Amino acid sequence: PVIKVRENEPFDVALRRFKRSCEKAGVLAEVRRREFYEKPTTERKRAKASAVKRHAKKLARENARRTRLY
């Protein structure tokens, strides 16, 4: 992330554009990830679990669209 504050730009807008750039690059997430060591087994387990969540969402998401609640 590296914002040039352009000429005729409010600071508040430029600051918001900096926040965007950092959230896009994912700096804070990268820092928090690397704060402590994750064992490879731990890393693999969460990768597996995230995939299973997204899958078990996707299938059961379609189920909610079909059936009426009331």
Binding site: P1, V2, A25
Partner: protein, 66 residues
């Protein structure tokens, strides 16, 4: 999405073609996911190798801060 390399029918992505490679990196210099660009897996692997070769030759940057 959609893959430009399948469309053109390319064989190698080529590390020398910086104009192309610049489309597949972020502002930060990072390689963009195939899920974003819609590149085919086969070409994404070639593209990564190309970018990494270019970064070594200092045709691309490794990061935004050198």
């Amino acid at each position: 999405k959609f893959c430009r390399f399948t469309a053109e029918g390319v064989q190698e992505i080529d590390y020398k073609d910086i104009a192309t490679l610049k489309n597949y990196i972020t502002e930060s210099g990072k390689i963009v996911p195939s899920r974003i660009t819609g590149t085919r897996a086969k070409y994404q692997r070639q593209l990564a190798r190309a970018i990494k070769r270019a970064r070594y030759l200092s045709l691309l940057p490794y990061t935004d801060r050198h």
